[PDB]
Structures are given as structure tokens and as C-alpha cells.
PDB file of all heavy atoms in Angstrom:
ATOM      1  N   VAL A   1     -40.745 -15.083  60.570  1.00 39.82           N
ATOM      2  CA  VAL A   1     -39.458 -14.454  61.232  1.00 39.82           C
ATOM      3  C   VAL A   1     -39.935 -13.571  62.269  1.00 39.82           C
ATOM      4  O   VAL A   1     -40.902 -12.820  62.120  1.00 39.82           O
ATOM      5  CB  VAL A   1     -38.622 -13.764  60.053  1.00 39.82           C
ATOM      6  CG1 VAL A   1     -38.148 -14.707  59.015  1.00 39.82           C
ATOM      7  CG2 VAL A   1     -39.415 -12.608  59.569  1.00 39.82           C
ATOM      8  N   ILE A   2     -39.101 -13.644  63.355  1.00 38.67           N
ATOM      9  CA  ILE A   2     -39.331 -12.754  64.490  1.00 38.67           C
ATOM     10  C   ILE A   2     -38.305 -11.716  64.499  1.00 38.67           C
ATOM     11  O   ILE A   2     -37.284 -11.863  63.780  1.00 38.67           O
ATOM     12  CB  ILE A   2     -39.201 -13.487  65.866  1.00 38.67           C
ATOM     13  CG1 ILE A   2     -37.764 -14.079  66.018  1.00 38.67           C
ATOM     14  CG2 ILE A   2     -40.291 -14.605  66.000  1.00 38.67           C
ATOM     15  CD1 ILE A   2     -37.461 -14.718  67.318  1.00 38.67           C
ATOM     16  N   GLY A   3     -38.539 -10.615  65.124  1.00 39.75           N
ATOM     17  CA  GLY A   3     -37.544  -9.564  65.133  1.00 39.75           C
ATOM     18  C   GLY A   3     -36.882  -9.193  66.522  1.00 39.75           C
ATOM     19  O   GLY A   3     -37.483  -9.266  67.502  1.00 39.75           O
ATOM     20  N   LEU A   4     -35.602  -9.044  66.516  1.00 36.64           N
ATOM     21  CA  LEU A   4     -34.863  -8.793  67.752  1.00 36.64           C
ATOM     22  C   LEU A   4     -34.401  -7.357  67.634  1.00 36.64           C
ATOM     23  O   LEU A   4     -33.414  -7.008  66.981  1.00 36.64           O
ATOM     24  CB  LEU A   4     -33.642  -9.717  67.938  1.00 36.64           C
ATOM     25  CG  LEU A   4     -33.982 -11.266  68.065  1.00 36.64           C
ATOM     26  CD1 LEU A   4     -32.738 -11.968  68.065  1.00 36.64           C
ATOM     27  CD2 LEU A   4     -34.915 -11.423  69.239  1.00 36.64           C
ATOM     28  N   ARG A   5     -35.065  -6.402  68.300  1.00 39.09           N
ATOM     29  CA  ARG A   5     -34.657  -5.007  68.297  1.00 39.09           C
ATOM     30  C   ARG A   5     -33.557  -4.898  69.260  1.00 39.09           C
ATOM     31  O   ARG A   5     -33.679  -5.108  70.526  1.00 39.09           O
ATOM     32  CB  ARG A   5     -35.942  -4.172  68.717  1.00 39.09           C
ATOM     33  CG  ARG A   5     -35.564  -2.663  68.822  1.00 39.09           C
ATOM     34  CD  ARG A   5     -35.310  -2.063  67.453  1.00 39.09           C
ATOM     35  NE  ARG A   5     -36.521  -1.955  66.697  1.00 39.09           N
ATOM     36  CZ  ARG A   5     -36.523  -1.547  65.445  1.00 39.09           C
ATOM     37  NH1 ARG A   5     -35.420  -1.202  64.807  1.00 39.09           N
ATOM     38  NH2 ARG A   5     -37.669  -1.655  64.688  1.00 39.09           N
ATOM     39  N   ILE A   6     -32.431  -4.411  68.803  1.00 39.69           N
ATOM     40  CA  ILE A   6     -31.249  -4.138  69.741  1.00 39.69           C
ATOM     41  C   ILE A   6     -30.967  -2.805  70.162  1.00 39.69           C
ATOM     42  O   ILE A   6     -31.420  -1.795  69.509  1.00 39.69           O
ATOM     43  CB  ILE A   6     -29.934  -4.729  69.019  1.00 39.69           C
ATOM     44  CG1 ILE A   6     -30.151  -6.106  68.384  1.00 39.69           C
ATOM     45  CG2 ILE A   6     -28.740  -4.633  69.979  1.00 39.69           C
ATOM     46  CD1 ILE A   6     -30.507  -7.035  69.474  1.00 39.69           C
ATOM     47  N   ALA A   7     -30.386  -2.592  71.352  1.00 40.17           N
ATOM     48  CA  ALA A   7     -30.072  -1.376  71.867  1.00 40.17           C
ATOM     49  C   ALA A   7     -29.419  -0.536  70.836  1.00 40.17           C
ATOM     50  O   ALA A   7     -28.440  -1.056  70.150  1.00 40.17           O
ATOM     51  CB  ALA A   7     -29.159  -1.397  73.100  1.00 40.17           C
ATOM     52  N   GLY A   8     -29.762   0.574  70.506  1.00 41.92           N
ATOM     53  CA  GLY A   8     -29.179   1.456  69.413  1.00 41.92           C
ATOM     54  C   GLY A   8     -30.169   1.577  68.345  1.00 41.92           C
ATOM     55  O   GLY A   8     -30.154   2.652  67.699  1.00 41.92           O
ATOM     56  N   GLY A   9     -31.160   0.684  68.194  1.00 40.07           N
ATOM     57  CA  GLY A   9     -32.113   0.819  67.142  1.00 40.07           C
ATOM     58  C   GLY A   9     -32.170  -0.303  66.031  1.00 40.07           C
ATOM     59  O   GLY A   9     -33.123  -0.380  65.382  1.00 40.07           O
ATOM     60  N   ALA A  10     -31.046  -1.054  65.884  1.00 41.20           N
ATOM     61  CA  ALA A  10     -30.946  -2.046  64.851  1.00 41.20           C
ATOM     62  C   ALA A  10     -32.004  -3.174  65.055  1.00 41.20           C
ATOM     63  O   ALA A  10     -32.388  -3.345  66.197  1.00 41.20           O
ATOM     64  CB  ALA A  10     -29.574  -2.599  64.735  1.00 41.20           C
ATOM     65  N   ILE A  11     -32.449  -3.865  64.120  1.00 41.72           N
ATOM     66  CA  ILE A  11     -33.306  -4.933  64.306  1.00 41.72           C
ATOM     67  C   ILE A  11     -32.988  -6.091  63.299  1.00 41.72           C
ATOM     68  O   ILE A  11     -32.877  -5.949  62.076  1.00 41.72           O
ATOM     69  CB  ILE A  11     -34.809  -4.556  64.052  1.00 41.72           C
ATOM     70  CG1 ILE A  11     -35.701  -5.713  64.302  1.00 41.72           C
ATOM     71  CG2 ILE A  11     -34.978  -3.985  62.605  1.00 41.72           C
ATOM     72  CD1 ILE A  11     -37.235  -5.323  64.474  1.00 41.72           C
ATOM     73  N   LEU A  12     -32.913  -7.330  63.910  1.00 44.16           N
ATOM     74  CA  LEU A  12     -32.593  -8.617  63.043  1.00 44.16           C
ATOM     75  C   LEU A  12     -33.884  -9.360  62.932  1.00 44.16           C
ATOM     76  O   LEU A  12     -34.569  -9.647  63.991  1.00 44.16           O
ATOM     77  CB  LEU A  12     -31.629  -9.386  63.862  1.00 44.16           C
ATOM     78  CG  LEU A  12     -31.203 -10.769  63.260  1.00 44.16           C
ATOM     79  CD1 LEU A  12     -30.435 -10.658  62.038  1.00 44.16           C
ATOM     80  CD2 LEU A  12     -30.496 -11.612  64.279  1.00 44.16           C
ATOM     81  N   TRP A  13     -34.253  -9.728  61.706  1.00 40.97           N
ATOM     82  CA  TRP A  13     -35.405 -10.576  61.539  1.00 40.97           C
ATOM     83  C   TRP A  13     -34.855 -11.969  60.932  1.00 40.97           C
ATOM     84  O   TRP A  13     -34.313 -12.100  59.967  1.00 40.97           O
ATOM     85  CB  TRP A  13     -36.338  -9.865  60.423  1.00 40.97           C
ATOM     86  CG  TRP A  13     -37.006  -8.757  60.790  1.00 40.97           C
ATOM     87  CD1 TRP A  13     -36.653  -7.364  60.628  1.00 40.97           C
ATOM     88  CD2 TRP A  13     -38.253  -8.607  61.541  1.00 40.97           C
ATOM     89  NE1 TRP A  13     -37.475  -6.490  61.183  1.00 40.97           N
ATOM     90  CE2 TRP A  13     -38.555  -7.184  61.777  1.00 40.97           C
ATOM     91  CE3 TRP A  13     -39.111  -9.521  62.068  1.00 40.97           C
ATOM     92  CZ2 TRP A  13     -39.652  -6.823  62.469  1.00 40.97           C
ATOM     93  CZ3 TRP A  13     -40.249  -9.167  62.797  1.00 40.97           C
ATOM     94  CH2 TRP A  13     -40.486  -7.823  62.947  1.00 40.97           C
ATOM     95  N   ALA A  14     -35.228 -12.945  61.759  1.00 41.20           N
ATOM     96  CA  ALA A  14     -34.747 -14.309  61.483  1.00 41.20           C
ATOM     97  C   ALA A  14     -35.814 -15.297  61.960  1.00 41.20           C
ATOM     98  O   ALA A  14     -36.756 -14.934  62.759  1.00 41.20           O
ATOM     99  CB  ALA A  14     -33.391 -14.571  62.165  1.00 41.20           C
ATOM    100  N   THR A  15     -35.728 -16.523  61.555  1.00 39.37           N
ATOM    101  CA  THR A  15     -36.682 -17.585  61.980  1.00 39.37           C
ATOM    102  C   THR A  15     -36.298 -17.688  63.456  1.00 39.37           C
ATOM    103  O   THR A  15     -35.240 -17.433  63.875  1.00 39.37           O
ATOM    104  CB  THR A  15     -36.408 -18.865  61.148  1.00 39.37           C
ATOM    105  OG1 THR A  15     -35.116 -19.226  61.241  1.00 39.37           O
ATOM    106  CG2 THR A  15     -36.923 -18.731  59.674  1.00 39.37           C
ATOM    107  N   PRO A  16     -37.276 -18.295  64.207  1.00 38.44           N
ATOM    108  CA  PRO A  16     -37.150 -18.474  65.668  1.00 38.44           C
ATOM    109  C   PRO A  16     -36.050 -19.487  65.897  1.00 38.44           C
ATOM    110  O   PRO A  16     -35.474 -19.500  67.014  1.00 38.44           O
ATOM    111  CB  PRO A  16     -38.478 -18.900  66.102  1.00 38.44           C
ATOM    112  CG  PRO A  16     -39.094 -19.604  64.991  1.00 38.44           C
ATOM    113  CD  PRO A  16     -38.679 -18.596  63.801  1.00 38.44           C
ATOM    114  N   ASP A  17     -35.690 -20.372  64.952  1.00 37.87           N
ATOM    115  CA  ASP A  17     -34.630 -21.360  65.225  1.00 37.87           C
ATOM    116  C   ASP A  17     -33.267 -20.907  64.697  1.00 37.87           C
ATOM    117  O   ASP A  17     -32.368 -21.681  64.857  1.00 37.87           O
ATOM    118  CB  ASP A  17     -35.037 -22.689  64.629  1.00 37.87           C
ATOM    119  CG  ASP A  17     -35.206 -22.624  63.043  1.00 37.87           C
ATOM    120  OD1 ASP A  17     -35.456 -21.466  62.504  1.00 37.87           O
ATOM    121  OD2 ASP A  17     -35.186 -23.652  62.411  1.00 37.87           O
ATOM    122  N   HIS A  18     -33.127 -19.718  64.163  1.00 38.93           N
ATOM    123  CA  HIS A  18     -31.869 -19.295  63.712  1.00 38.93           C
ATOM    124  C   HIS A  18     -30.969 -18.920  64.950  1.00 38.93           C
ATOM    125  O   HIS A  18     -31.434 -18.315  65.885  1.00 38.93           O
ATOM    126  CB  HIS A  18     -31.955 -17.991  62.819  1.00 38.93           C
ATOM    127  CG  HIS A  18     -30.744 -17.762  61.936  1.00 38.93           C
ATOM    128  ND1 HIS A  18     -30.643 -18.336  60.739  1.00 38.93           N
ATOM    129  CD2 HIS A  18     -29.641 -17.038  62.148  1.00 38.93           C
ATOM    130  CE1 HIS A  18     -29.392 -18.011  60.178  1.00 38.93           C
ATOM    131  NE2 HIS A  18     -28.791 -17.282  61.170  1.00 38.93           N
ATOM    132  N   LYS A  19     -29.733 -19.399  64.858  1.00 37.13           N
ATOM    133  CA  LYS A  19     -28.807 -19.215  65.994  1.00 37.13           C
ATOM    134  C   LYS A  19     -28.050 -17.911  65.982  1.00 37.13           C
ATOM    135  O   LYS A  19     -27.632 -17.486  64.951  1.00 37.13           O
ATOM    136  CB  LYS A  19     -27.759 -20.391  66.118  1.00 37.13           C
ATOM    137  CG  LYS A  19     -28.412 -21.747  66.318  1.00 37.13           C
ATOM    138  CD  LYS A  19     -27.447 -22.808  66.306  1.00 37.13           C
ATOM    139  CE  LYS A  19     -28.057 -24.174  66.517  1.00 37.13           C
ATOM    140  NZ  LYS A  19     -29.031 -24.545  65.321  1.00 37.13           N
ATOM    141  N   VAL A  20     -27.966 -17.297  67.141  1.00 39.16           N
ATOM    142  CA  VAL A  20     -27.336 -15.991  67.408  1.00 39.16           C
ATOM    143  C   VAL A  20     -26.297 -16.117  68.475  1.00 39.16           C
ATOM    144  O   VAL A  20     -26.509 -16.994  69.471  1.00 39.16           O
ATOM    145  CB  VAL A  20     -28.417 -14.960  67.915  1.00 39.16           C
ATOM    146  CG1 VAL A  20     -27.774 -13.613  68.043  1.00 39.16           C
ATOM    147  CG2 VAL A  20     -29.601 -14.977  66.976  1.00 39.16           C
ATOM    148  N   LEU A  21     -25.137 -15.502  68.386  1.00 38.50           N
ATOM    149  CA  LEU A  21     -24.072 -15.557  69.327  1.00 38.50           C
ATOM    150  C   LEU A  21     -24.484 -14.624  70.478  1.00 38.50           C
ATOM    151  O   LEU A  21     -24.674 -13.375  70.190  1.00 38.50           O
ATOM    152  CB  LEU A  21     -22.730 -15.181  68.786  1.00 38.50           C
ATOM    153  CG  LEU A  21     -21.602 -15.087  69.806  1.00 38.50           C
ATOM    154  CD1 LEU A  21     -21.488 -16.266  70.632  1.00 38.50           C
ATOM    155  CD2 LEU A  21     -20.307 -14.740  69.141  1.00 38.50           C
ATOM    156  N   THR A  22     -24.644 -15.103  71.710  1.00 38.13           N
ATOM    157  CA  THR A  22     -24.964 -14.255  72.815  1.00 38.13           C
ATOM    158  C   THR A  22     -24.004 -14.368  73.923  1.00 38.13           C
ATOM    159  O   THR A  22     -23.050 -15.173  73.880  1.00 38.13           O
ATOM    160  CB  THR A  22     -26.428 -14.772  73.386  1.00 38.13           C
ATOM    161  OG1 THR A  22     -26.297 -16.008  74.070  1.00 38.13           O
ATOM    162  CG2 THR A  22     -27.357 -14.978  72.246  1.00 38.13           C
ATOM    163  N   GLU A  23     -24.211 -13.704  74.965  1.00 35.92           N
ATOM    164  CA  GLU A  23     -23.325 -13.580  76.163  1.00 35.92           C
ATOM    165  C   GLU A  23     -23.285 -15.069  76.849  1.00 35.92           C
ATOM    166  O   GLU A  23     -22.324 -15.272  77.643  1.00 35.92           O
ATOM    167  CB  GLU A  23     -23.808 -12.488  77.090  1.00 35.92           C
ATOM    168  CG  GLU A  23     -25.345 -12.797  77.500  1.00 35.92           C
ATOM    169  CD  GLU A  23     -25.815 -11.912  78.523  1.00 35.92           C
ATOM    170  OE1 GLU A  23     -24.991 -11.320  79.300  1.00 35.92           O
ATOM    171  OE2 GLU A  23     -27.043 -11.651  78.692  1.00 35.92           O
ATOM    172  N   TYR A  24     -24.215 -15.809  76.526  1.00 37.48           N
ATOM    173  CA  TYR A  24     -24.204 -17.185  77.079  1.00 37.48           C
ATOM    174  C   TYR A  24     -24.010 -18.207  75.990  1.00 37.48           C
ATOM    175  O   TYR A  24     -24.351 -19.420  76.238  1.00 37.48           O
ATOM    176  CB  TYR A  24     -25.559 -17.494  77.909  1.00 37.48           C
ATOM    177  CG  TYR A  24     -25.720 -16.421  78.929  1.00 37.48           C
ATOM    178  CD1 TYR A  24     -26.947 -15.616  79.032  1.00 37.48           C
ATOM    179  CD2 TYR A  24     -24.808 -16.209  79.981  1.00 37.48           C
ATOM    180  CE1 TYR A  24     -27.091 -14.684  79.988  1.00 37.48           C
ATOM    181  CE2 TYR A  24     -24.963 -15.244  80.962  1.00 37.48           C
ATOM    182  CZ  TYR A  24     -26.150 -14.503  80.993  1.00 37.48           C
ATOM    183  OH  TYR A  24     -26.325 -13.593  81.908  1.00 37.48           O
ATOM    184  N   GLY A  25     -23.404 -17.890  74.928  1.00 38.61           N
ATOM    185  CA  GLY A  25     -23.120 -18.745  73.770  1.00 38.61           C
ATOM    186  C   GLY A  25     -24.188 -18.686  72.683  1.00 38.61           C
ATOM    187  O   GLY A  25     -25.013 -17.828  72.710  1.00 38.61           O
ATOM    188  N   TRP A  26     -24.117 -19.763  71.776  1.00 39.16           N
ATOM    189  CA  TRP A  26     -25.130 -19.744  70.693  1.00 39.16           C
ATOM    190  C   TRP A  26     -26.465 -20.164  71.133  1.00 39.16           C
ATOM    191  O   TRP A  26     -26.593 -21.077  71.891  1.00 39.16           O
ATOM    192  CB  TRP A  26     -24.649 -20.704  69.662  1.00 39.16           C
ATOM    193  CG  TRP A  26     -23.423 -20.250  68.902  1.00 39.16           C
ATOM    194  CD1 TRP A  26     -22.083 -20.554  69.198  1.00 39.16           C
ATOM    195  CD2 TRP A  26     -23.368 -19.309  67.824  1.00 39.16           C
ATOM    196  NE1 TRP A  26     -21.300 -19.797  68.404  1.00 39.16           N
ATOM    197  CE2 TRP A  26     -22.014 -19.056  67.535  1.00 39.16           C
ATOM    198  CE3 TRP A  26     -24.387 -18.595  67.092  1.00 39.16           C
ATOM    199  CZ2 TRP A  26     -21.574 -18.273  66.451  1.00 39.16           C
ATOM    200  CZ3 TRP A  26     -23.884 -17.833  66.066  1.00 39.16           C
ATOM    201  CH2 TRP A  26     -22.595 -17.593  65.769  1.00 39.16           C
ATOM    202  N   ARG A  27     -27.497 -19.461  70.717  1.00 42.67           N
ATOM    203  CA  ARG A  27     -28.896 -19.730  71.103  1.00 42.67           C
ATOM    204  C   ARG A  27     -29.753 -19.310  70.047  1.00 42.67           C
ATOM    205  O   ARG A  27     -29.679 -18.361  69.302  1.00 42.67           O
ATOM    206  CB  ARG A  27     -29.301 -18.949  72.428  1.00 42.67           C
ATOM    207  CG  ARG A  27     -28.412 -19.380  73.625  1.00 42.67           C
ATOM    208  CD  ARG A  27     -28.938 -18.641  74.868  1.00 42.67           C
ATOM    209  NE  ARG A  27     -30.240 -19.008  75.176  1.00 42.67           N
ATOM    210  CZ  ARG A  27     -30.971 -18.297  76.163  1.00 42.67           C
ATOM    211  NH1 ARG A  27     -30.552 -17.343  76.893  1.00 42.67           N
ATOM    212  NH2 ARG A  27     -32.339 -18.888  76.436  1.00 42.67           N
ATOM    213  N   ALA A  28     -30.934 -20.116  69.939  1.00 40.54           N
ATOM    214  CA  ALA A  28     -32.013 -19.867  69.039  1.00 40.54           C
ATOM    215  C   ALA A  28     -32.641 -18.503  69.244  1.00 40.54           C
ATOM    216  O   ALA A  28     -32.808 -18.188  70.417  1.00 40.54           O
ATOM    217  CB  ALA A  28     -33.043 -20.910  69.002  1.00 40.54           C
ATOM    218  N   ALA A  29     -32.798 -17.722  68.218  1.00 36.58           N
ATOM    219  CA  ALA A  29     -33.382 -16.360  68.280  1.00 36.58           C
ATOM    220  C   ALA A  29     -34.665 -16.415  69.120  1.00 36.58           C
ATOM    221  O   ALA A  29     -34.993 -15.482  69.901  1.00 36.58           O
ATOM    222  CB  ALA A  29     -33.634 -15.851  66.953  1.00 36.58           C
ATOM    223  N   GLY A  30     -35.540 -17.503  68.814  1.00 33.77           N
ATOM    224  CA  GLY A  30     -36.756 -17.646  69.476  1.00 33.77           C
ATOM    225  C   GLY A  30     -36.692 -17.789  71.068  1.00 33.77           C
ATOM    226  O   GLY A  30     -37.743 -17.726  71.694  1.00 33.77           O
ATOM    227  N   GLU A  31     -35.472 -18.138  71.595  1.00 35.73           N
ATOM    228  CA  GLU A  31     -35.352 -18.374  73.015  1.00 35.73           C
ATOM    229  C   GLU A  31     -34.974 -16.964  73.720  1.00 35.73           C
ATOM    230  O   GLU A  31     -35.081 -16.859  74.948  1.00 35.73           O
ATOM    231  CB  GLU A  31     -34.360 -19.331  73.332  1.00 35.73           C
ATOM    232  CG  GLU A  31     -34.578 -20.631  72.511  1.00 35.73           C
ATOM    233  CD  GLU A  31     -33.707 -21.847  73.016  1.00 35.73           C
ATOM    234  OE1 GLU A  31     -32.417 -21.460  73.452  1.00 35.73           O
ATOM    235  OE2 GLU A  31     -33.946 -22.966  72.908  1.00 35.73           O
ATOM    236  N   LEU A  32     -34.535 -16.081  72.923  1.00 33.73           N
ATOM    237  CA  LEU A  32     -33.931 -14.777  73.398  1.00 33.73           C
ATOM    238  C   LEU A  32     -35.140 -13.838  73.935  1.00 33.73           C
ATOM    239  O   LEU A  32     -36.172 -13.749  73.308  1.00 33.73           O
ATOM    240  CB  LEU A  32     -33.075 -14.120  72.427  1.00 33.73           C
ATOM    241  CG  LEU A  32     -32.031 -15.032  71.914  1.00 33.73           C
ATOM    242  CD1 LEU A  32     -31.135 -14.323  70.855  1.00 33.73           C
ATOM    243  CD2 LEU A  32     -31.189 -15.493  73.012  1.00 33.73           C
ATOM    244  N   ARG A  33     -34.840 -13.108  74.970  1.00 34.55           N
ATOM    245  CA  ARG A  33     -35.735 -12.131  75.558  1.00 34.55           C
ATOM    246  C   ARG A  33     -35.114 -10.847  75.824  1.00 34.55           C
ATOM    247  O   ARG A  33     -33.881 -10.659  75.793  1.00 34.55           O
ATOM    248  CB  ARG A  33     -36.324 -12.639  76.843  1.00 34.55           C
ATOM    249  CG  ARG A  33     -36.988 -14.128  76.744  1.00 34.55           C
ATOM    250  CD  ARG A  33     -38.403 -14.002  76.064  1.00 34.55           C
ATOM    251  NE  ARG A  33     -39.000 -15.353  76.122  1.00 34.55           N
ATOM    252  CZ  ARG A  33     -38.864 -16.234  75.092  1.00 34.55           C
ATOM    253  NH1 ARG A  33     -38.139 -16.058  74.081  1.00 34.55           N
ATOM    254  NH2 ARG A  33     -39.550 -17.427  75.187  1.00 34.55           N
ATOM    255  N   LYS A  34     -35.987  -9.827  76.025  1.00 34.03           N
ATOM    256  CA  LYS A  34     -35.485  -8.460  76.377  1.00 34.03           C
ATOM    257  C   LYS A  34     -34.498  -8.598  77.463  1.00 34.03           C
ATOM    258  O   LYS A  34     -34.660  -9.333  78.446  1.00 34.03           O
ATOM    259  CB  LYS A  34     -36.723  -7.575  76.838  1.00 34.03           C
ATOM    260  CG  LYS A  34     -36.312  -6.106  77.268  1.00 34.03           C
ATOM    261  CD  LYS A  34     -37.573  -5.401  77.816  1.00 34.03           C
ATOM    262  CE  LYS A  34     -38.606  -5.428  76.822  1.00 34.03           C
ATOM    263  NZ  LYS A  34     -39.938  -4.950  77.421  1.00 34.03           N
ATOM    264  N   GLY A  35     -33.367  -7.860  77.360  1.00 32.57           N
ATOM    265  CA  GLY A  35     -32.353  -7.940  78.390  1.00 32.57           C
ATOM    266  C   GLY A  35     -31.182  -8.839  78.006  1.00 32.57           C
ATOM    267  O   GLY A  35     -30.047  -8.583  78.394  1.00 32.57           O
ATOM    268  N   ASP A  36     -31.444  -9.935  77.178  1.00 31.79           N
ATOM    269  CA  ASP A  36     -30.261 -10.792  76.796  1.00 31.79           C
ATOM    270  C   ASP A  36     -29.407  -9.925  75.907  1.00 31.79           C
ATOM    271  O   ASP A  36     -29.792  -9.120  75.116  1.00 31.79           O
ATOM    272  CB  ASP A  36     -30.869 -11.895  76.018  1.00 31.79           C
ATOM    273  CG  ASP A  36     -31.584 -12.909  76.930  1.00 31.79           C
ATOM    274  OD1 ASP A  36     -31.231 -13.054  78.148  1.00 31.79           O
ATOM    275  OD2 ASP A  36     -32.453 -13.622  76.361  1.00 31.79           O
ATOM    276  N   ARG A  37     -28.093 -10.185  76.008  1.00 33.37           N
ATOM    277  CA  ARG A  37     -27.160  -9.488  75.271  1.00 33.37           C
ATOM    278  C   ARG A  37     -26.590 -10.325  74.037  1.00 33.37           C
ATOM    279  O   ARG A  37     -26.261 -11.501  74.251  1.00 33.37           O
ATOM    280  CB  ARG A  37     -25.951  -8.941  75.992  1.00 33.37           C
ATOM    281  CG  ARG A  37     -26.369  -7.984  77.075  1.00 33.37           C
ATOM    282  CD  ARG A  37     -25.123  -7.495  77.788  1.00 33.37           C
ATOM    283  NE  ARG A  37     -24.356  -8.619  78.429  1.00 33.37           N
ATOM    284  CZ  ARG A  37     -23.108  -8.507  78.672  1.00 33.37           C
ATOM    285  NH1 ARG A  37     -22.389  -7.372  78.330  1.00 33.37           N
ATOM    286  NH2 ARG A  37     -22.438  -9.500  79.212  1.00 33.37           N
ATOM    287  N   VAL A  38     -26.640  -9.726  72.801  1.00 33.36           N
ATOM    288  CA  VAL A  38     -26.108 -10.381  71.716  1.00 33.36           C
ATOM    289  C   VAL A  38     -24.765  -9.844  71.168  1.00 33.36           C
ATOM    290  O   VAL A  38     -24.562  -8.659  71.427  1.00 33.36           O
ATOM    291  CB  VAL A  38     -27.120 -10.250  70.552  1.00 33.36           C
ATOM    292  CG1 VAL A  38     -28.436 -10.923  70.924  1.00 33.36           C
ATOM    293  CG2 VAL A  38     -27.303  -8.882  70.094  1.00 33.36           C
ATOM    294  N   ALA A  39     -24.017 -10.635  70.454  1.00 34.75           N
ATOM    295  CA  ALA A  39     -22.742 -10.160  69.969  1.00 34.75           C
ATOM    296  C   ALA A  39     -22.931  -9.320  68.713  1.00 34.75           C
ATOM    297  O   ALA A  39     -23.568  -9.664  67.780  1.00 34.75           O
ATOM    298  CB  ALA A  39     -21.827 -11.327  69.617  1.00 34.75           C
ATOM    299  N   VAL A  40     -22.386  -8.069  68.746  1.00 35.89           N
ATOM    300  CA  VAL A  40     -22.537  -7.066  67.636  1.00 35.89           C
ATOM    301  C   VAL A  40     -21.188  -6.513  67.182  1.00 35.89           C
ATOM    302  O   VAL A  40     -20.385  -6.123  67.999  1.00 35.89           O
ATOM    303  CB  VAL A  40     -23.588  -5.941  67.927  1.00 35.89           C
ATOM    304  CG1 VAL A  40     -24.836  -6.556  68.481  1.00 35.89           C
ATOM    305  CG2 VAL A  40     -22.938  -4.876  68.889  1.00 35.89           C
ATOM    306  N   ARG A  41     -21.012  -6.358  65.859  1.00 35.27           N
ATOM    307  CA  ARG A  41     -19.816  -5.706  65.324  1.00 35.27           C
ATOM    308  C   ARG A  41     -20.046  -4.295  65.113  1.00 35.27           C
ATOM    309  O   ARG A  41     -21.002  -3.795  64.332  1.00 35.27           O
ATOM    310  CB  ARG A  41     -19.515  -6.463  63.939  1.00 35.27           C
ATOM    311  CG  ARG A  41     -18.404  -5.705  63.209  1.00 35.27           C
ATOM    312  CD  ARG A  41     -18.155  -6.311  61.806  1.00 35.27           C
ATOM    313  NE  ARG A  41     -17.072  -5.747  61.102  1.00 35.27           N
ATOM    314  CZ  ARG A  41     -17.160  -4.510  60.551  1.00 35.27           C
ATOM    315  NH1 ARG A  41     -18.210  -3.813  60.582  1.00 35.27           N
ATOM    316  NH2 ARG A  41     -16.060  -4.064  60.011  1.00 35.27           N
TER     317      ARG A  41
END
């Protein structure tokens, strides 16, 4: 599992193929890079 550290300090640990809702739609966590914005509640 890779970790996506988000602005604010939170961190999501998921497999690289797990899908995340982003500013450009659904995308595998493994394709995301610093700067990409994810949907957060």
C-alpha cells in the first residue's frame, strides 16, 4: 500500500490500484502525484 499525504496532515494508505475521486475524476492512487487535488469531506 502506498501513502497519499494530504494538505492538512492526513494520510491515506491504499493499494496503488485503489481508485480515488480527484479534481480530474476517478483515478488510481498509484497515478497521483504531489500537487494533484483529491476530494475530501
Side-chain angles (χ1 to χ4, degrees):
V1 296
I2 59 174
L4 299 179
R5 177 68 68 185
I6 308 304
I11 183 165
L12 173 75
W13 290 97
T15 50
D17 62 339
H18 200 85
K19 296 181 186 60
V20 186
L21 172 56
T22 74
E23 50 176 340
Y24 302 123
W26 292 94
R27 296 183 67 187
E31 313 183 327
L32 309 179
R33 304 283 184 275
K34 179 185 305 170
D36 289 331
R37 298 184 300 153
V38 302
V40 312
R41 170 186 184 282

